[PDB]
Every structure is written in C-alpha cells, then in structure tokens.
Amino acid sequence: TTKANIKLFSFTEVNDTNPLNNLNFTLKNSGKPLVDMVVLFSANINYDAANDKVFVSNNPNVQHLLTNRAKYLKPLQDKGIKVILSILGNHDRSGIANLSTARAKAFAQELKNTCDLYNLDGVFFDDEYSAYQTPPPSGFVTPSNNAAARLAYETKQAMPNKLVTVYVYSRTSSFPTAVDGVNAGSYVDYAIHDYGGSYDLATNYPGLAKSGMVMSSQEFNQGRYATAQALRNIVTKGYGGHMIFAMDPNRSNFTSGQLPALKLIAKELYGDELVYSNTPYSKDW
Ligand SMILES: [Zn+2]
C-alpha cells in the first residue's frame, strides 16, 4: 500500500553507468520506486594555485550529466528521487579534511553555487585520494576529523534545506566535538557505512538519530553483498537506510548477483516484491 520509511541510497559510478537505470526498479504493491536517493559518484575537490582557491572539479562524465540534467537528472527528481553530488579528493594538497575555517566557508559557498546551478539536492563527503602535504600549505591544516566537521557544518549553514551526508570512513567517520557549539546531529543528515558496516552511529555523530544511519552497504561491482539477517536488523533496530554501490543492469553479474540482491532488499526492507522494467539505459556519452 505505502512504502516503508527506510531510504535506499544508490551510488552511480558516472564514469561507467547512466543514472537513469535507477528508474528501472519499482515496488509491486506500493507502486513506488525502490531507490530513494541517487548519489553521483563523483565530483572532486581541487586546488587552483593561481587564485589560491579550492573548487569543485567535475570530470567530463560528471559535467556531461550536469550539463544535460533535464535528460539525466530531472526524470529522477520528477519521481521524487533526491540527487546528491559526491565530493572526493583528487591528488592535490586539498581535501575534505584539511581546510582552515576560512577555506571551509569559501568551499561551502562553492558547493552552494553548484547545487543551485544544477538543482542538486545535496552533497556526500568522501575523504579519499587527496595528496595531503606536510607541513600544511597556507590556509590548510593538518588533516583531521575536526577540520572535516567544520566543512560539513559550514556546508549545512550555506544550504540548510539541502542534504549533507558523510561516509563512515577515514576523517569523516566521527565528529565528536561540537562546531561553534552545535552537535553533529544538527548538520549531518545521513552518515553512510562502508561495505558491511553495521554498528550504531550515535556516539560517532552525537545527536544523529537512528533515521539518519545508513547500514550495511553493498558493493554490486565487487559483489560484496548483505545477508538477509543484516537487512532484517535494519528493520528491527529502526535504522533509516541502506546503500548499494555501482548497480548496473548492463554488467555481466546482473542476473546472477545484482538482481537476487535487489529482490532481497524489496522483500526484507519493504516486505514487497520487485519489478524490473528491462529498459536499456547505456552510457550514451
Ligand atoms: Zn585519480
């Protein structure tokens, strides 16, 4: 009748897959889409040495989708699916976890600009691949969860109506110290576990409610799947979401690995049945 209030996050590797594939899965009884949020993986954080500015760097694949958002993103949004832009390190001195307070304020502004320009629903922070320097260059600090917390906090302040989501990994795995006297629960909307993670996040992000905790993420390319027991645990403990990374009906493992997992999610999380459309969406770029 109605879809359970457990959000399914689907991370689409834009270098490989068309995000419209997220439309191909429906819940038989409720008639609703299986996927609640699509994360475009991923844009990058980069440093412009000339203007000493940190900026959102989009590779040709991300750019393609943003540029053509009426084609690739609007159809998701029209169905009520939220579209989130991931931000990842990109081999230079800048990253998610080493901005000074001033730089964090400036980057949060950049994020806000990007989200406004392309009508994005929020961001996902993943602190990986930056080439952090020692000692820290000018306007950068030693990488730390506290510096990451500052960025997440400034991002929320810049766009209070949009989603701020973080990875339970590296320096965004915990924000135990208030920022300007505000707790994590006040600026983080969702914290997403690394593959198979299932522990409670309340102490990692003080103030974060169970509804903001995304558990036992699956990796559909590598074939790292959740058990039925792990999914039932989400329902019985009252957690708010689940995540799947790199779903792609065009990959050779779809029938043998992906589909059975998607059917298990429909059953265990939503107590319903999966309907797969069988609509081709290829990387047409
Ligand atoms: Zn690279």
Curated annotation (Swiss-Prot):
The keyword Secreted applies. One of its GO terms (biological process) is carbohydrate metabolic process. Residues 6-272 form the GH18 domain. GO terms for cellular component: extracellular region. The active site is at E128 (proton donor). Residues 285 form a propeptide. It is found in: Secreted. GO terms for molecular function: mannosyl-glycoprotein endo-beta-N-acetylglucosaminidase activity. It catalyses: an N(4)-(oligosaccharide-(1->3)-[oligosaccharide-(1->6)]-beta-D-Man-(1->4)-beta-D-GlcNAc-(1->4)-alpha-D-GlcNAc)-L-asparaginyl-[protein] + H2O = an oligosaccharide-(1->3)-[oligosaccharide-(1->6)]-beta-D-Man-(1->4)-D-GlcNAc + N(4)-(N-acetyl-beta-D-glucosaminyl)-L-asparaginyl-[protein]. It is an enzyme of class 3 (hydrolase). Its main location: secreted. Its EC number is 3.2.1.96. Keywords: Glycosidase, Hydrolase, Secreted, Signal. Belongs to the glycosyl hydrolase 18 family. Endohydrolysis of the di-N-acetylchitobiosyl unit in high-mannose glycopeptides and glycoproteins. Does not hydrolyze complex bi- or triantennary glycans. The presence of a core-bound fucose impedes endo F1 hydrolysis. Monomer. This is Endo-beta-N-acetylglucosaminidase F1. It comes from Elizabethkingia meningoseptica (Chryseobacterium meningosepticum). The lineage of its organism: Bacteria, Pseudomonadati, Bacteroidota, Flavobacteriia, Flavobacteriales. The gene is endOF1. The chain holds residues 55 to 339 of 339 of the full protein.
